[PDB]
C-alpha cells in the first residue's frame, strides 16, 4: 500500500514542518512512513512532522481532550515532544484554517499544554506568541569548539542548554566562525546539550549560531534562542527583559520574566498539495 | 501581486525537480523565484525548476519551435545542466500527463534536442531510456582522494569527468569509503572535474559513487553513470557493452555503442499541489 496524503509545507524560522491534517484520527503514521517523507530528495522534504488531531483521540495525552494536539514527529521517526519553534507553525495552521475560534488558545503536546497568542496571521503568514516556561539556569560551565573555550549558562528550557555570550564578538565574526561538534562537560549534561554562540546585547538584540544535540547546526532552536537571551541578559547585568534575537533562519523577539517567558516569531505556509508513500 | 502556481515535485534517481507546468507560456519565473523555491527549508525545496513550456516560447531556443522544450533551471537560477536525469523526468511528466501521444518522441534542451523511449508509465513511476550522446573519451589520468591515488578515464560528456575504476574495491569497500574532494592533475582539468569512484564490472554491473566539481557528493549523476560505464568496459578490455550501474539514489542501465550511448532509469513523481510567490 502507496498511500496518499494531503499535506501542507511550511516553517518557522526556516526549522521546516510537514503539516498532516488528520482531524478524524483515521491516518496509522508509522516512524518508516515519517522518515519517507522528511527524506529532502526521496520524499517531501523536512525537520518533522506535524499531524494534527484532538488530544482525545492521542493516548497517553495528559491535556484537556477537547484541545487540538501537535503530534509532533521528528524526521528520523521518533517521538518528539515540543518545538519552540513547530508550535509557532502548529498554531498558524490551527487559526488560519478556522479550526479554533480565538487569536489565544491552548495547544496540547507530549510536554504538557502549550499556551499562544496569534498577532497577526493570514493563511501564509504569521506572528506567533508562545509561552516557553521559566528559564532555569543550572549553573556555570564551558564547551571547547574547534580548540576554543567558550564560557556559558547551563539552562534548562525543558531541555538543555549551554548559552555561550562571548565578550567581544561581532555579527560578522559569529558568522565566519567555523563551528563543530562541542566537546563538554559529561557530568553537568550527562544527555547531551544544544550550544548556542551568541553575541553580547547591543541596542535589545543579538545574535546566536546553535549546535542543536543529535543534530548539528540548524537554521533555528526556539528554546535556544530563550536559552541565549537568558544568558544575553545575564552577561549585562539584568534579570528581565525583551531580547531580539537574530538566528540563521530569521529573527525572534524573546521576554524573560521571574516567572516565565515568550517567544515570538514567524511562521509561514508554503504549499498546500498531496504526497504519496511507500 | 502574489501568484499561486501548480507544481509537481518528483526526482529521477534522487535527483530532484519541481515540476511547473506553463504550457502557454505565462509565467516569467526569474532567477531569484527559481532559488527561493528551491530553498530546502524556506521553499520547497529541489536540485532545480522544470519549467513545462514549447520551443516556440523559450528565448534563443532554435530547435523545431513544435518541440516540448526541459526548460530547467538549476537551485541557484542558472541554466547550464550537468548530469542529465531531469530529461528522464521531463519525459515521464510528458508521457503521463498526455502531452505526448507516443512512448517515442523528442525533447527539446538548451544542450539541443534529446531523443526518449518511455519503457514504462504511469502517474507516480516511470523507466525511461535517454539518447546520451557519443562519450568523448579523454584518456588516462589520476586523482588523490584523502591520501589514496586512483587511475581513472576521462570522460567529456558535454562537461568533464574522470571515473576511476577500483580493481579489488568491493560495493561495501565503497560505501565506506570516506570521500572528500578530489584533487587532481590541474594540467588535464584546468577547470576541475566530476570524479567517479567505481567498482570493476561484475555480473554486468558496478557502484558507484561521485563528486560533482563545486558540489560535492550527489545521489546520482545521470552522465557520470555514462563515463562509469565507459571507464569499466575499458578497465575490462573492451570499448563497447551494458553495464548496470548502482549509485546511491538507485541504479541505472547505461549502453555504450561505437557511436553513441544510452542511459535507461527510473523517475518519480510524488507529489502534486500548489505554491504561492510574488510575481517578478
Given at each position: 500500500?502507496?498511500?496518499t496524503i494531503p499535506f501542507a509545507k511550511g516553517?518557522?524560522?526556516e526549522n521546516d514542518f510537514i503539516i498532516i491534517p488528520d482531524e478524524d484520527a483515521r491516518l496509522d503514521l508509522t516512524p518508516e512512513m515519517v522518515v519517507t517523507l522528511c527524506d529532502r530528495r526521496a520524499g517531501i522534504g523536512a525537520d518533522g512532522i506535524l499531524r494534527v488531531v484532538k488530544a482525545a483521540d492521542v493516548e497517553g495525552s495528559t491535556v484537556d481532550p477537547s484541545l487540538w494536539f501537535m503530534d509532533y514527529?521528528?524526521?528520523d521517526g521518533s517521538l518528539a515532544e515540543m518545538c519552540g519553534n513547530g508550535v509557532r507553525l502548529f498554531?498558524?495552521?490551527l487559526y488560519s484554517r478556522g479550526l479554533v475560534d480565538n487569536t489565544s488558545f491552548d495547544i496540547g503536546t507530549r510536554a504538557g499544554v502549550r499556551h499562544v497568542d496569534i498577532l497577526q496571521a493570514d493563511?501564509?503568514?504569521?506572528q506567533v506568541r508562545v509561552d516557553m516556561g521559566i528559564p532555569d539556569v543550572t549553573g556555570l560551565s564551558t564547551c571547547d569548539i574547534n580548540g576554543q573555550?567558550?564560557?556559558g549558562l547551563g539552562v534548562d528550557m525543558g531541555n538543555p542548554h549551554l548559552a555561550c555570550v562571548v565578550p567581544g564578538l561581532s555579527a560578522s565574526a559569529l558568522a565566519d566562525m567555523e563551528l563543530r561538534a562541542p566537546t563538554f562537560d559529561q557530568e553537568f549534561?550527562?544527555?547531551g546539550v544544544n550550544v548556542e554562540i551568541v553575541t553580547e546585547l547591543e541596542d535589545d538584540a543579538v545574535s546566536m549560531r546553535v549546535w542543536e544535540r543529535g543534530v548539528g547546526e540548524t537554521r533555528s532552536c526556539g528554546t535556544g534562542t530563550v536559552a541565549a537571551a537568558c544568558a544575553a541578559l545575564a552577561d549585562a547585568g539584568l534579570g528581565e527583559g525583551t531580547v531580539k534575537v537574530c538566528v540563521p533562519g530569521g529573527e525572534v523577539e524573546?521576554?524573560?520574566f521571574d516567572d516565565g517567558s515568550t517567544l515570538t516569531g514567524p511562521s509561514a505556509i508554503i504549499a498546500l498539495g498531496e504526497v504519496q508513500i511507500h
Amino acid at each position: 500500500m502507496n498511500l496518499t496524503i494531503p499535506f501542507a509545507k511550511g516553517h518557522a524560522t526556516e526549522n521546516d514542518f510537514i503539516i498532516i491534517p488528520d482531524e478524524d484520527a483515521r491516518l496509522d503514521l508509522t516512524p518508516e512512513m515519517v522518515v519517507t517523507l522528511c527524506d529532502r530528495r526521496a520524499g517531501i522534504g523536512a525537520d518533522g512532522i506535524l499531524r494534527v488531531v484532538k488530544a482525545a483521540d492521542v493516548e497517553g495525552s495528559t491535556v484537556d481532550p477537547s484541545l487540538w494536539f501537535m503530534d509532533y514527529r521528528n524526521a528520523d521517526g521518533s517521538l518528539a515532544e515540543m518545538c519552540g519553534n513547530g508550535v509557532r507553525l502548529f498554531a498558524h495552521w490551527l487559526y488560519s484554517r478556522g479550526l479554533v475560534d480565538n487569536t489565544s488558545f491552548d495547544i496540547g503536546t507530549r510536554a504538557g499544554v502549550r499556551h499562544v497568542d496569534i498577532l497577526q496571521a493570514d493563511q501564509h503568514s504569521a506572528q506567533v506568541r508562545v509561552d516557553m516556561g521559566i528559564p532555569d539556569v543550572t549553573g556555570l560551565s564551558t564547551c571547547d569548539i574547534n580548540g576554543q573555550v567558550f564560557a556559558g549558562l547551563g539552562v534548562d528550557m525543558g531541555n538543555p542548554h549551554l548559552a555561550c555570550v562571548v565578550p567581544g564578538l561581532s555579527a560578522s565574526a559569529l558568522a565566519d566562525m567555523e563551528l563543530r561538534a562541542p566537546t563538554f562537560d559529561q557530568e553537568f549534561f550527562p544527555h547531551g546539550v544544544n550550544v548556542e554562540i551568541v553575541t553580547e546585547l547591543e541596542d535589545d538584540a543579538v545574535s546566536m549560531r546553535v549546535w542543536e544535540r543529535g543534530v548539528g547546526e540548524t537554521r533555528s532552536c526556539g528554546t535556544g534562542t530563550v536559552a541565549a537571551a537568558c544568558a544575553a541578559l545575564a552577561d549585562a547585568g539584568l534579570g528581565e527583559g525583551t531580547v531580539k534575537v537574530c538566528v540563521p533562519g530569521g529573527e525572534v523577539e524573546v521576554q524573560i520574566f521571574d516567572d516565565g517567558s515568550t517567544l515570538t516569531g514567524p511562521s509561514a505556509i508554503i504549499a498546500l498539495g498531496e504526497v504519496q508513500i511507500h
